[PDB]
UniProtKB/Swiss-Prot annotation, chain A:
SUPFAM superfamilies found in the cross-reference section: Homeodomain-like (SSF46689), Tetracyclin repressor-like, C-terminal domain (SSF48498)
A GO molecular-function annotation: transcription cis-regulatory region binding
Expression induction: Induced 4- to 8-fold in the presence of toluene; this is controlled by TtgX, a possible efflux pump global regulator. Induced by chloramphenicol and probably by tetracycline.
Gene name of the record: ttgR
InterPro entries according to UniProt: DNA-bd_HTH_TetR-type_CS, Homeodomain-like_sf, HTH-type_TetR-like_transc_reg, HTH_TetR, Tet_transcr_reg_TetR-rel_C_sf, Tscrpt_reg_MAATS_C
Cellular component terms per the entry's GO annotation: protein-DNA complex
DNA-binding found in the keyword field: yes
Pfam families: TetR_C_2, TetR_N
Residue ranges annotated for the HTH tetR-type domain, each copy included: 6-66
Quaternary structure (record): Homodimer.
This protein's name: HTH-type transcriptional regulator TtgR
Keywords: DNA-binding, Repressor, Transcription, Transcription regulation
DNA-binding region ranges: 29-48
Function as written in the Swiss-Prot or TrEMBL entry: Represses expression from the ttgABC operon promoter and its own expression. Binds to a promoter region between the divergently transcribed ttgR and ttgABC genes/operons; in the presence of chloramphenicol or tetracycline this binding no longer occurs and ttgR and ttgABC are derepressed. This suggests that TtgR binds these antibiotics.
Length: 206, 205
């Protein structure tokens, strides 16, 4: 039963990471993920309708580790939301450098996953996630404005974009040129540089 | 002319269409040649492989901006920061206004995988970004050797932070266009980033 279904789902997802990583999403089909996993073909199709659905499963496995700190950062009851957002970003960067799984998935998302008309769902998916992530940072930022943590007149919306843009470019930079930027030693300076932009930038106000 | 000089240009325009439609990984020279109306032999004449075409698209982005870029990185110039702000203004303008620039960037960012089959693509991108970094740092060095940026700021970590902000903003606009108002609020976006290189203590040491 159940136990055995939910072990081969883990086996499928794990061969998917390895296969998308070696060969990229474009030219890896479910047929090939099946063989690496050792499962059958019908195993995969019961589990995952198609490739876009599997890509979304990997992208979802990234949320688990950061869950708690993000919903706390976002609740208007919490009294130190910018410190919750700070500590999230520290955990996001640490996990990236320490957890090879997390780094591998991010490198698939960033450097091995094309947007083509062939599978529009991958693009669509991604637009949702960045919108989701946008919705959260905004609420959290608004919370920091009320709590007088960041300038009281701040554009929460444009600040959320600046910040997402900075964190995303930084992750991508290090995925590309790791031995350049020591993300694990200065990790505090990287998170803080971005956060400074939100409290000091006049361009982000009004 | 002779035979065509601008067969090269016609192959490049077909490469952008092929790559934009179906992405770099599953585009062959045969697709590109069929699309260009020439033979594969005519392609190998200008290019040894696909990675070279990808390189040519990349290199074509530096043409419009190279003047404000060269002006920013020299000592002679009076206004180094104002040249980075102008360059970045032109970068964001060309992107929103030119479809070709927008398509080349959407190819680079969202339509080109880094794989073992073609490791020259990841390599060419590393060098391109390292090249860009040497530049940003030189531009940031003379600005601090002036009234423009705080004294003894780590030129290099601010170079990374800025390249990262801009690169992430561009990619974000390509993903969700009608969410950044990239054109019109242009001034604010460029400045949000440049405010970062002064105002931020974390960028100091
Ligand atoms: O939660 C966040 C998050 O996940 C990311 C992010 C960006 C790219 C990735 O590849 C990734 O794994 C994470 O940026 C953020 C930036 C913020 O200011 C606040 C956040 O809460 C997140
Ligand atoms: O010249 C620059 C440039 O080109 C880009 C850039 C980044 C990502 C792209 O995808 C792109 O097309 C351009 O960022 C910059 C950031 C700076 O601080 C200074 C610059 O001079 C540039």
């Amino acid at each position: 039963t159940k136990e055995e279904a939910q072990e081969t789902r883990a086996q499928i997802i794990e061969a998917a990471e390895r296969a998308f990583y070696k060969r990229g999403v474009a030219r890896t089909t479910l047929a090939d993920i099946a063989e690496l996993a050792g499962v059958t073909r019908g195993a995969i199709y019961w589990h995952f309708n198609n490739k876009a659905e599997l890509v979304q499963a990997l992208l979802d496995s990234l949320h688990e580790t950061h869950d708690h700190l993000a919903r706390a950062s976002e609740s208007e009851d919490e009294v130190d939301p910018l410190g919750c957002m700070r500590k999230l970003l520290l955990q996001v960067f640490n996990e990236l450098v320490l957890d090879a799984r997390t780094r591998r998935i991010n490198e698939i998302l960033h450097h091995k996953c094309e947007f083509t008309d062939d599978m529009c769902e991958i693009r669509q998916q991604r637009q949702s996630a960045v919108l989701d992530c946008h919705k959260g940072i905004t609420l959290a930022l608004a919370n920091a404005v009320r709590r007088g943590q960041l300038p009281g007149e701040l554009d929460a919306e444009r600040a959320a974009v600046a910040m997402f843009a900075y964190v995303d470019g930084l992750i991508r930079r290090w995925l590309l040129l790791p031995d350049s930027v020591d993300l694990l030693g200065d990790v505090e300076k990287w998170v803080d540089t971005g956060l400074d932009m939100l409290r000091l930038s006049p361009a982000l106000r009004k």
